[PDB]
Amino acid sequence: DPTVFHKRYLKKIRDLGGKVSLYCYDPTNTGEMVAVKALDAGPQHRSGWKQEIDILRTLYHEHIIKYKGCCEDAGAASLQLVMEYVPLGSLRDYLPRHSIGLAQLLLFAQQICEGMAYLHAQHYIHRNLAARNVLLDNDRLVKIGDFGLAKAVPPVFWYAPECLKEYKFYYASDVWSFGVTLYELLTHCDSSQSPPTKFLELIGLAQGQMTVLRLTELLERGERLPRPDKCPAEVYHLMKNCWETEASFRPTFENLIPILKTVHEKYQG
Ligand SMILES: NC(=O)c1cnc2[nH]ccc2c1N[C@@H]1[C@@H]2C[C@@H]3C[C@H]1C[C@@](O)(C3)C2
């Protein structure tokens, strides 16, 4: 996509959270809200940035945030990435404020799997799958964002043992993160139940440089996040399956889609 946004029609509304900001884009001096990501940076962060832009340019799917174009970023001697803006924001902000039923959360889970299967079918890994990077376009439509860490296959509290211990990252490693993301959904991203809160409670906060190693030891011993309240046993077993220590015993996102379809159906009625 070679779409170019002219800086002259861009007015900043707010920062969204690399840095992503919300702009109005209005050439008739009433128009479209857009999210714009901008790259301070130096040590080949620039090449990673070119990677992100090129990855997003090629991805087109209902459950992946839509690429809209680029604009000259004279101030960082780069491009800025222009994306669709989603007003409800990320599930991290939305879920604490609302009380979503199980069937709806399962639908979100299914849609995340669809976007991720698509991504994997493109030979890309995401490496940052967490509730905070899942955006809610409408009450029944989820989109995966934040491709900042995404890579062509040649967040430590969301990472599988092979990532933490060996610095490897498989398709199966994104499936582990999906498991943790699904746990977030079922706890409505309550901070007191969050993966950092729960794992720091076991590890403690006085382990010098060894936090990650301690986390790894607990995972390899088979320690896992608890069953959220009113998560069905079968959904908890699905999560535990996304968390197999051995990467090859995890389901793929392709495996997960028909299962999640079926369970959503069951809880919907
Ligand atoms: N298209 C977008 O990026 C985007 C689109 N609509 C949005 N509405 C509110 C935030 C937001 C977006 N924000 C980003 C998203 C969520 C949060 C903050 C931004 C960086 C983050 O990593 C973490 C991914």
Side-chain angles (χ1 to χ4, degrees):
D1 189 326
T3 304
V4 187
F5 286 78
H6 316 295
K7 299 295 276 285
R8 65 197 280 243
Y9 305 114
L10 275 183
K11 110 132 203 280
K12 194 167 143 182
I13 312 299
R14 56 167 172 122
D15 291 318
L16 295 180
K19 183 182 187 55
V20 185
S21 302
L22 167 65
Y23 291 78
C24 181
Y25 184 72
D26 187 15
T28 330
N29 316 349
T30 161
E32 210 174 31
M33 310 272 147
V34 289
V36 193
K37 189 163 176 189
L39 180 68
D40 205 12
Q44 65 129 212
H45 275 283
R46 289 178 160 260
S47 62
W49 183 233
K50 192 83 197 295
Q51 167 143 239
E52 189 175 358
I53 291 169
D54 289 300
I55 293 170
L56 218 69
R57 286 214 283 158
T58 67
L59 300 169
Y60 189 83
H61 192 272
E62 43 198 325
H63 301 302
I64 296 182
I65 190 76
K66 93 168 207 81
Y67 182 79
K68 284 189 96 62
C70 64
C71 66
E72 206 202 321
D73 186 7
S78 194
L79 311 174
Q80 285 158 281
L81 178 58
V82 186
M83 308 173 273
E84 78 171 320
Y85 170 62
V86 167
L88 272 24
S90 94
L91 293 176
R92 190 213 176 266
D93 315 318
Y94 187 77
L95 295 171
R97 265 47 86 83
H98 303 85
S99 289
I100 313 280
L102 175 57
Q104 190 165 353
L105 301 175
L106 287 169
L107 179 61
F108 292 167
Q110 185 202 314
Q111 296 177 349
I112 293 160
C113 292
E114 294 181 75
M116 291 299 301
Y118 168 87
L119 183 74
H120 284 190
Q122 301 333 112
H123 306 89
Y124 289 116
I125 48 170
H126 187 279
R127 292 203 291 139
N128 203 13
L129 181 60
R132 63 186 170 269
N133 303 320
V134 184
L135 291 288
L136 223 221
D137 175 281
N138 69 55
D139 221 46
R140 329 136 80 146
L141 210 181
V142 120
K143 330 236 191 208
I144 296 151
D146 198 348
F147 290 79
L149 288 173
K151 281 191 170 187
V153 189
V156 311
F157 295 107
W158 285 253
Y159 277 2
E162 72 271 7
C163 308
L164 296 183
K165 216 182 147 171
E166 301 186 86
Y167 315 120
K168 289 166 186 315
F169 202 103
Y170 307 118
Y171 297 122
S173 308
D174 276 333
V175 169
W176 177 292
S177 314
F178 163 76
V180 182
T181 301
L182 172 54
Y183 172 89
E184 290 182 279
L185 264 44
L186 277 12
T187 60
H188 295 251
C189 296
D190 175 8
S191 58
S192 81
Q193 297 180 76
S194 71
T197 300
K198 294 269 170 191
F199 285 123
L200 289 171
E201 177 186 10
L202 304 165
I203 294 161
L205 295 336
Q207 294 294 326
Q209 298 175 262
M210 303 295 147
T211 305
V212 166
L213 197 249
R214 296 278 103 83
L215 174 54
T216 299
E217 291 165 1
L218 285 174
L219 300 170
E220 290 193 313
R221 283 185 221 158
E223 308 290 16
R224 298 292 182 270
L225 289 159
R227 190 182 60 89
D229 227 79
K230 304 174 153 55
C231 170
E234 68 183 340
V235 171
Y236 188 58
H237 283 113
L238 188 44
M239 277 179 250
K240 279 197 159 159
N241 193 30
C242 297
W243 299 327
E244 297 294 338
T245 300
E246 166 57 46
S248 65
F249 295 164
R250 301 179 204 146
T252 65
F253 282 109
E254 180 209 347
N255 299 326
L256 285 165
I257 299 162
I259 290 175
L260 280 165
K261 277 179 177 169
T262 304
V263 310
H264 163 65
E265 278 253 46
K266 174 172 173 177
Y267 297 95
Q268 245 311 313

mmCIF file of all heavy atoms in Angstrom, residues 14-17 19-22 34-37 56 65-66 82-93 128 131-136 144-148, ligand 1:
data_model
loop_
_atom_site.group_PDB
_atom_site.id
_atom_site.type_symbol
_atom_site.label_atom_id
_atom_site.label_comp_id
_atom_site.label_asym_id
_atom_site.label_seq_id
_atom_site.Cartn_x
_atom_site.Cartn_y
_atom_site.Cartn_z
ATOM 1 N N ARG A 14 -4.545 13.034 21.088
ATOM 2 C CA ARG A 14 -3.883 12.545 22.303
ATOM 3 C C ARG A 14 -2.875 11.460 21.989
ATOM 4 O O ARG A 14 -2.867 10.915 20.899
ATOM 5 C CB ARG A 14 -4.907 11.994 23.320
ATOM 6 C CG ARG A 14 -5.821 10.888 22.784
ATOM 7 C CD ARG A 14 -6.574 10.166 23.907
ATOM 8 N NE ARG A 14 -7.588 9.238 23.368
ATOM 9 C CZ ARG A 14 -7.635 7.928 23.620
ATOM 10 N NH1 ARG A 14 -6.747 7.366 24.427
ATOM 11 N NH2 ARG A 14 -8.586 7.174 23.086
ATOM 12 N N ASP A 15 -2.019 11.171 22.961
ATOM 13 C CA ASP A 15 -1.142 10.017 22.881
ATOM 14 C C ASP A 15 -1.919 8.762 23.268
ATOM 15 O O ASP A 15 -2.809 8.794 24.138
ATOM 16 C CB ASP A 15 0.080 10.227 23.765
ATOM 17 C CG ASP A 15 0.985 11.310 23.230
ATOM 18 O OD1 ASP A 15 1.228 11.376 21.979
ATOM 19 O OD2 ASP A 15 1.471 12.092 24.065
ATOM 20 N N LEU A 16 -1.631 7.673 22.567
ATOM 21 C CA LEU A 16 -2.331 6.436 22.836
ATOM 22 C C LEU A 16 -1.496 5.508 23.715
ATOM 23 O O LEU A 16 -2.045 4.762 24.512
ATOM 24 C CB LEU A 16 -2.844 5.780 21.532
ATOM 25 C CG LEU A 16 -3.920 6.591 20.775
ATOM 26 C CD1 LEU A 16 -4.402 5.924 19.491
ATOM 27 C CD2 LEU A 16 -5.121 6.883 21.653
ATOM 28 N N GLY A 17 -0.183 5.564 23.567
ATOM 29 C CA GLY A 17 0.711 4.740 24.356
ATOM 30 C C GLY A 17 2.050 4.636 23.673
ATOM 31 O O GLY A 17 2.193 5.072 22.532
ATOM 32 N N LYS A 19 5.968 5.244 19.748
ATOM 33 C CA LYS A 19 4.871 6.001 20.383
ATOM 34 C C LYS A 19 3.684 6.034 19.421
ATOM 35 O O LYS A 19 3.875 6.287 18.253
ATOM 36 C CB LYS A 19 5.355 7.415 20.681
ATOM 37 C CG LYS A 19 4.393 8.339 21.403
ATOM 38 C CD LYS A 19 5.064 9.701 21.535
ATOM 39 C CE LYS A 19 4.258 10.666 22.385
ATOM 40 N NZ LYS A 19 3.959 10.106 23.742
ATOM 41 N N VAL A 20 2.467 5.761 19.902
ATOM 42 C CA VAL A 20 1.278 5.787 19.066
ATOM 43 C C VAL A 20 0.375 6.941 19.573
ATOM 44 O O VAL A 20 0.121 7.062 20.773
ATOM 45 C CB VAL A 20 0.513 4.439 19.106
ATOM 46 C CG1 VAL A 20 -0.663 4.421 18.130
ATOM 47 C CG2 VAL A 20 1.448 3.236 18.837
ATOM 48 N N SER A 21 -0.113 7.758 18.645
ATOM 49 C CA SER A 21 -0.977 8.919 18.957
ATOM 50 C C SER A 21 -2.215 8.941 18.090
ATOM 51 O O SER A 21 -2.231 8.383 16.965
ATOM 52 C CB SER A 21 -0.214 10.232 18.717
ATOM 53 O OG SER A 21 0.947 10.289 19.500
ATOM 54 N N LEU A 22 -3.254 9.594 18.609
ATOM 55 C CA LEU A 22 -4.506 9.726 17.895
ATOM 56 C C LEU A 22 -4.520 11.084 17.221
ATOM 57 O O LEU A 22 -4.246 12.103 17.866
ATOM 58 C CB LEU A 22 -5.687 9.559 18.853
ATOM 59 C CG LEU A 22 -7.073 9.953 18.362
ATOM 60 C CD1 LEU A 22 -7.573 9.071 17.214
ATOM 61 C CD2 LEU A 22 -8.047 9.960 19.534
ATOM 62 N N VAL A 34 -7.450 8.687 13.023
ATOM 63 C CA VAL A 34 -6.423 7.669 12.736
ATOM 64 C C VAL A 34 -5.402 7.567 13.874
ATOM 65 O O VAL A 34 -5.133 8.558 14.592
ATOM 66 C CB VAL A 34 -5.665 7.923 11.393
ATOM 67 C CG1 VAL A 34 -6.557 7.648 10.181
ATOM 68 C CG2 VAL A 34 -4.994 9.311 11.343
ATOM 69 N N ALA A 35 -4.842 6.360 14.024
ATOM 70 C CA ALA A 35 -3.736 6.108 14.924
ATOM 71 C C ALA A 35 -2.440 6.229 14.146
ATOM 72 O O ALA A 35 -2.300 5.670 13.048
ATOM 73 C CB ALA A 35 -3.861 4.730 15.562
ATOM 74 N N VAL A 36 -1.474 6.949 14.697
ATOM 75 C CA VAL A 36 -0.203 7.133 13.992
ATOM 76 C C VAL A 36 0.910 6.728 14.927
ATOM 77 O O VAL A 36 0.994 7.223 16.048
ATOM 78 C CB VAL A 36 0.001 8.589 13.439
ATOM 79 C CG1 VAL A 36 1.160 8.619 12.455
ATOM 80 C CG2 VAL A 36 -1.271 9.118 12.754
ATOM 81 N N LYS A 37 1.718 5.782 14.483
ATOM 82 C CA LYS A 37 2.887 5.333 15.233
ATOM 83 C C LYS A 37 4.162 5.954 14.647
ATOM 84 O O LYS A 37 4.359 5.969 13.429
ATOM 85 C CB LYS A 37 2.989 3.791 15.240
ATOM 86 C CG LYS A 37 4.077 3.249 16.182
ATOM 87 C CD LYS A 37 3.890 1.776 16.489
ATOM 88 C CE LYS A 37 5.018 1.202 17.350
ATOM 89 N NZ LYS A 37 4.860 -0.295 17.400
ATOM 90 N N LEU A 56 3.056 -4.850 8.557
ATOM 91 C CA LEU A 56 1.699 -4.310 8.538
ATOM 92 C C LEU A 56 1.182 -4.022 7.117
ATOM 93 O O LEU A 56 0.033 -4.308 6.835
ATOM 94 C CB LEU A 56 1.548 -3.081 9.446
ATOM 95 C CG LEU A 56 0.187 -3.105 10.146
ATOM 96 C CD1 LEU A 56 0.135 -4.240 11.161
ATOM 97 C CD2 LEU A 56 -0.177 -1.792 10.825
ATOM 98 N N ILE A 65 -5.366 -5.153 12.963
ATOM 99 C CA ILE A 65 -5.509 -3.701 12.864
ATOM 100 C C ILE A 65 -5.168 -3.286 11.423
ATOM 101 O O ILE A 65 -4.183 -3.763 10.864
ATOM 102 C CB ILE A 65 -4.642 -2.971 13.941
ATOM 103 C CG1 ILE A 65 -4.968 -1.472 13.997
ATOM 104 C CG2 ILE A 65 -3.135 -3.200 13.770
ATOM 105 C CD1 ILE A 65 -6.287 -1.200 14.707
ATOM 106 N N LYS A 66 -5.998 -2.443 10.821
ATOM 107 C CA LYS A 66 -5.788 -2.185 9.392
ATOM 108 C C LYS A 66 -4.796 -1.069 9.129
ATOM 109 O O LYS A 66 -4.887 -0.001 9.734
ATOM 110 C CB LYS A 66 -7.095 -2.156 8.552
ATOM 111 C CG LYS A 66 -7.794 -0.832 8.324
ATOM 112 C CD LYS A 66 -8.864 -0.992 7.245
ATOM 113 C CE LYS A 66 -9.152 0.303 6.492
ATOM 114 N NZ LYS A 66 -8.177 0.618 5.404
ATOM 115 N N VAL A 82 0.484 4.888 9.655
ATOM 116 C CA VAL A 82 -0.871 5.351 9.893
ATOM 117 C C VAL A 82 -1.778 4.147 9.862
ATOM 118 O O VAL A 82 -1.780 3.393 8.879
ATOM 119 C CB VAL A 82 -1.339 6.413 8.863
ATOM 120 C CG1 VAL A 82 -2.703 6.964 9.268
ATOM 121 C CG2 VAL A 82 -0.322 7.545 8.760
ATOM 122 N N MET A 83 -2.548 3.990 10.945
ATOM 123 C CA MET A 83 -3.449 2.867 11.136
ATOM 124 C C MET A 83 -4.850 3.327 11.484
ATOM 125 O O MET A 83 -5.074 4.492 11.921
ATOM 126 C CB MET A 83 -2.932 1.984 12.262
ATOM 127 C CG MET A 83 -1.478 1.543 12.131
ATOM 128 S SD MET A 83 -0.933 0.683 13.624
ATOM 129 C CE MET A 83 -0.383 2.029 14.673
ATOM 130 N N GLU A 84 -5.799 2.423 11.271
ATOM 131 C CA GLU A 84 -7.126 2.593 11.804
ATOM 132 C C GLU A 84 -7.090 2.813 13.332
ATOM 133 O O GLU A 84 -6.256 2.226 14.070
ATOM 134 C CB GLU A 84 -8.067 1.460 11.391
ATOM 135 C CG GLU A 84 -7.917 0.159 12.146
ATOM 136 C CD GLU A 84 -9.012 -0.847 11.850
ATOM 137 O OE1 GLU A 84 -10.192 -0.453 11.731
ATOM 138 O OE2 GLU A 84 -8.690 -2.045 11.749
ATOM 139 N N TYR A 85 -7.955 3.722 13.755
ATOM 140 C CA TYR A 85 -8.168 4.014 15.129
ATOM 141 C C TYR A 85 -9.384 3.240 15.578
ATOM 142 O O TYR A 85 -10.422 3.244 14.908
ATOM 143 C CB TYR A 85 -8.405 5.512 15.319
ATOM 144 C CG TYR A 85 -8.867 5.891 16.708
ATOM 145 C CD1 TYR A 85 -8.055 5.641 17.840
ATOM 146 C CD2 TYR A 85 -10.107 6.528 16.907
ATOM 147 C CE1 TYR A 85 -8.478 5.998 19.120
ATOM 148 C CE2 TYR A 85 -10.532 6.895 18.187
ATOM 149 C CZ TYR A 85 -9.715 6.630 19.283
ATOM 150 O OH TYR A 85 -10.121 7.007 20.545
ATOM 151 N N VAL A 86 -9.246 2.606 16.735
ATOM 152 C CA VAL A 86 -10.325 1.846 17.364
ATOM 153 C C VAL A 86 -10.737 2.560 18.672
ATOM 154 O O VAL A 86 -9.972 2.570 19.640
ATOM 155 C CB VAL A 86 -9.847 0.372 17.539
ATOM 156 C CG1 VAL A 86 -10.742 -0.411 18.457
ATOM 157 C CG2 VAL A 86 -9.732 -0.331 16.181
ATOM 158 N N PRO A 87 -11.937 3.205 18.706
ATOM 159 C CA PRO A 87 -12.276 4.047 19.896
ATOM 160 C C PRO A 87 -12.432 3.328 21.246
ATOM 161 O O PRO A 87 -12.075 3.904 22.281
ATOM 162 C CB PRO A 87 -13.598 4.759 19.505
ATOM 163 C CG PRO A 87 -13.876 4.367 18.087
ATOM 164 C CD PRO A 87 -13.035 3.167 17.722
ATOM 165 N N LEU A 88 -12.911 2.085 21.256
ATOM 166 C CA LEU A 88 -13.029 1.371 22.538
ATOM 167 C C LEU A 88 -11.697 1.010 23.197
ATOM 168 O O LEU A 88 -11.677 0.706 24.362
ATOM 169 C CB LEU A 88 -13.986 0.173 22.451
ATOM 170 C CG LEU A 88 -15.506 0.330 22.696
ATOM 171 C CD1 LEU A 88 -16.089 1.719 22.479
ATOM 172 C CD2 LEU A 88 -16.293 -0.696 21.894
ATOM 173 N N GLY A 89 -10.596 1.028 22.427
ATOM 174 C CA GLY A 89 -9.277 0.830 22.960
ATOM 175 C C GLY A 89 -8.971 -0.641 23.181
ATOM 176 O O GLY A 89 -9.577 -1.509 22.559
ATOM 177 N N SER A 90 -8.022 -0.924 24.065
ATOM 178 C CA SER A 90 -7.571 -2.301 24.264
ATOM 179 C C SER A 90 -8.409 -2.986 25.340
ATOM 180 O O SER A 90 -9.040 -2.324 26.190
ATOM 181 C CB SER A 90 -6.081 -2.343 24.604
ATOM 182 O OG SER A 90 -5.832 -2.364 25.996
ATOM 183 N N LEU A 91 -8.434 -4.311 25.298
ATOM 184 C CA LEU A 91 -9.213 -5.081 26.284
ATOM 185 C C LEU A 91 -8.731 -4.797 27.700
ATOM 186 O O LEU A 91 -9.519 -4.851 28.623
ATOM 187 C CB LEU A 91 -9.186 -6.573 25.977
ATOM 188 C CG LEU A 91 -9.916 -6.965 24.676
ATOM 189 C CD1 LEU A 91 -9.736 -8.452 24.410
ATOM 190 C CD2 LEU A 91 -11.404 -6.606 24.752
ATOM 191 N N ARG A 92 -7.428 -4.488 27.839
ATOM 192 C CA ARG A 92 -6.825 -4.041 29.122
ATOM 193 C C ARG A 92 -7.574 -2.850 29.789
ATOM 194 O O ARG A 92 -7.787 -2.856 30.997
ATOM 195 C CB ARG A 92 -5.342 -3.742 28.942
ATOM 196 C CG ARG A 92 -4.564 -3.500 30.237
ATOM 197 C CD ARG A 92 -3.445 -2.495 30.004
ATOM 198 N NE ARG A 92 -2.714 -2.159 31.231
ATOM 199 C CZ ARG A 92 -2.975 -1.114 32.020
ATOM 200 N NH1 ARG A 92 -3.963 -0.265 31.735
ATOM 201 N NH2 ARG A 92 -2.241 -0.918 33.109
ATOM 202 N N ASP A 93 -7.972 -1.866 28.994
ATOM 203 C CA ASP A 93 -8.720 -0.682 29.489
ATOM 204 C C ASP A 93 -10.209 -0.954 29.577
ATOM 205 O O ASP A 93 -10.849 -0.475 30.500
ATOM 206 C CB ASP A 93 -8.530 0.524 28.570
ATOM 207 C CG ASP A 93 -7.093 0.749 28.151
ATOM 208 O OD1 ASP A 93 -6.193 0.621 29.013
ATOM 209 O OD2 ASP A 93 -6.881 1.071 26.953
ATOM 210 N N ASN A 128 4.323 -10.564 21.090
ATOM 211 C CA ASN A 128 3.842 -9.616 22.084
ATOM 212 C C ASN A 128 2.356 -9.787 22.344
ATOM 213 O O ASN A 128 1.638 -8.784 22.531
ATOM 214 C CB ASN A 128 4.095 -8.180 21.544
ATOM 215 C CG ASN A 128 4.174 -7.137 22.643
ATOM 216 O OD1 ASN A 128 4.284 -7.446 23.843
ATOM 217 N ND2 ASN A 128 4.145 -5.885 22.229
ATOM 218 N N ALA A 131 -3.442 -9.075 26.502
ATOM 219 C CA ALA A 131 -4.693 -8.307 26.385
ATOM 220 C C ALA A 131 -4.521 -6.842 25.970
ATOM 221 O O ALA A 131 -5.428 -6.256 25.356
ATOM 222 C CB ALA A 131 -5.562 -8.417 27.652
ATOM 223 N N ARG A 132 -3.403 -6.224 26.376
ATOM 224 C CA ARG A 132 -3.245 -4.793 26.135
ATOM 225 C C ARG A 132 -3.109 -4.456 24.647
ATOM 226 O O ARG A 132 -3.353 -3.308 24.251
ATOM 227 C CB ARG A 132 -2.058 -4.209 26.929
ATOM 228 C CG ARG A 132 -0.708 -4.783 26.557
ATOM 229 C CD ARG A 132 0.429 -4.287 27.452
ATOM 230 N NE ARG A 132 1.632 -5.088 27.170
ATOM 231 C CZ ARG A 132 1.975 -6.204 27.809
ATOM 232 N NH1 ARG A 132 1.227 -6.656 28.818
ATOM 233 N NH2 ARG A 132 3.077 -6.863 27.443
ATOM 234 N N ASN A 133 -2.747 -5.468 23.844
ATOM 235 C CA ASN A 133 -2.528 -5.339 22.377
ATOM 236 C C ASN A 133 -3.680 -5.911 21.564
ATOM 237 O O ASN A 133 -3.583 -6.038 20.343
ATOM 238 C CB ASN A 133 -1.148 -5.968 21.986
ATOM 239 C CG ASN A 133 0.026 -5.334 22.760
ATOM 240 O OD1 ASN A 133 0.050 -4.130 22.963
ATOM 241 N ND2 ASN A 133 1.005 -6.144 23.171
ATOM 242 N N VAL A 134 -4.768 -6.290 22.239
ATOM 243 C CA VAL A 134 -6.007 -6.664 21.571
ATOM 244 C C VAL A 134 -6.991 -5.481 21.712
ATOM 245 O O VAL A 134 -7.340 -5.088 22.839
ATOM 246 C CB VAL A 134 -6.552 -8.016 22.141
ATOM 247 C CG1 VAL A 134 -7.808 -8.482 21.392
ATOM 248 C CG2 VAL A 134 -5.453 -9.107 22.025
ATOM 249 N N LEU A 135 -7.434 -4.939 20.564
ATOM 250 C CA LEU A 135 -8.282 -3.757 20.489
ATOM 251 C C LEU A 135 -9.696 -4.205 20.155
ATOM 252 O O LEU A 135 -9.888 -5.222 19.496
ATOM 253 C CB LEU A 135 -7.791 -2.817 19.368
ATOM 254 C CG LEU A 135 -6.449 -2.055 19.521
ATOM 255 C CD1 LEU A 135 -6.531 -0.921 20.545
ATOM 256 C CD2 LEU A 135 -5.277 -2.955 19.876
ATOM 257 N N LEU A 136 -10.669 -3.416 20.593
ATOM 258 C CA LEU A 136 -12.079 -3.776 20.508
ATOM 259 C C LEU A 136 -12.703 -2.748 19.584
ATOM 260 O O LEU A 136 -12.773 -1.555 19.920
ATOM 261 C CB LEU A 136 -12.716 -3.698 21.889
ATOM 262 C CG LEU A 136 -13.686 -4.701 22.523
ATOM 263 C CD1 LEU A 136 -14.775 -3.931 23.252
ATOM 264 C CD2 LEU A 136 -14.298 -5.726 21.585
ATOM 265 N N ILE A 144 -6.070 -7.468 16.567
ATOM 266 C CA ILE A 144 -4.732 -7.538 17.149
ATOM 267 C C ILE A 144 -3.940 -6.347 16.679
ATOM 268 O O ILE A 144 -3.886 -6.064 15.471
ATOM 269 C CB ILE A 144 -3.993 -8.847 16.739
ATOM 270 C CG1 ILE A 144 -4.731 -10.042 17.299
ATOM 271 C CG2 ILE A 144 -2.534 -8.820 17.211
ATOM 272 C CD1 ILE A 144 -4.567 -11.290 16.453
ATOM 273 N N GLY A 145 -3.325 -5.675 17.647
ATOM 274 C CA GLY A 145 -2.399 -4.566 17.405
ATOM 275 C C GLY A 145 -0.992 -4.868 17.835
ATOM 276 O O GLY A 145 -0.626 -6.048 18.107
ATOM 277 N N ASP A 146 -0.202 -3.795 17.883
ATOM 278 C CA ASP A 146 1.186 -3.766 18.296
ATOM 279 C C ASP A 146 2.101 -4.837 17.706
ATOM 280 O O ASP A 146 2.512 -5.808 18.395
ATOM 281 C CB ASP A 146 1.342 -3.734 19.809
ATOM 282 C CG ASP A 146 2.733 -3.260 20.236
ATOM 283 O OD1 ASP A 146 3.638 -3.189 19.360
ATOM 284 O OD2 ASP A 146 2.911 -2.946 21.443
ATOM 285 N N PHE A 147 2.469 -4.584 16.462
ATOM 286 C CA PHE A 147 3.371 -5.421 15.733
ATOM 287 C C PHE A 147 4.809 -4.988 15.874
ATOM 288 O O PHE A 147 5.630 -5.363 15.061
ATOM 289 C CB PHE A 147 2.916 -5.495 14.286
ATOM 290 C CG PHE A 147 1.659 -6.253 14.115
ATOM 291 C CD1 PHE A 147 0.405 -5.662 14.415
ATOM 292 C CD2 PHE A 147 1.697 -7.572 13.748
ATOM 293 C CE1 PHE A 147 -0.766 -6.402 14.294
ATOM 294 C CE2 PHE A 147 0.520 -8.308 13.633
ATOM 295 C CZ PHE A 147 -0.697 -7.733 13.912
ATOM 296 N N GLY A 148 5.100 -4.230 16.924
ATOM 297 C CA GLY A 148 6.436 -3.737 17.236
ATOM 298 C C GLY A 148 7.544 -4.773 17.376
ATOM 299 O O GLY A 148 8.712 -4.451 17.175
HETATM 300 N N1 LIG B 1 -3.999 1.159 16.015
HETATM 301 C C1 LIG B 1 -3.491 1.326 17.275
HETATM 302 O O1 LIG B 1 -2.320 1.105 17.542
HETATM 303 C C2 LIG B 1 -4.513 1.792 18.234
HETATM 304 C C3 LIG B 1 -5.779 2.003 17.700
HETATM 305 N N2 LIG B 1 -6.870 2.421 18.371
HETATM 306 C C4 LIG B 1 -6.601 2.638 19.676
HETATM 307 N N3 LIG B 1 -7.452 3.067 20.662
HETATM 308 C C5 LIG B 1 -6.852 3.193 21.877
HETATM 309 C C6 LIG B 1 -5.552 2.822 21.679
HETATM 310 C C7 LIG B 1 -5.397 2.470 20.307
HETATM 311 C C8 LIG B 1 -4.309 2.032 19.585
HETATM 312 N N4 LIG B 1 -3.233 2.007 20.460
HETATM 313 C C9 LIG B 1 -2.180 1.052 20.559
HETATM 314 C C10 LIG B 1 -2.609 -0.350 21.005
HETATM 315 C C11 LIG B 1 -3.180 -0.346 22.427
HETATM 316 C C12 LIG B 1 -2.214 0.288 23.439
HETATM 317 C C13 LIG B 1 -1.858 1.709 23.001
HETATM 318 C C14 LIG B 1 -1.253 1.725 21.580
HETATM 319 C C15 LIG B 1 0.041 0.931 21.602
HETATM 320 C C16 LIG B 1 -0.312 -0.507 22.021
HETATM 321 O O2 LIG B 1 0.857 -1.290 22.077
HETATM 322 C C17 LIG B 1 -0.907 -0.510 23.425
HETATM 323 C C18 LIG B 1 -1.279 -1.112 20.999
#
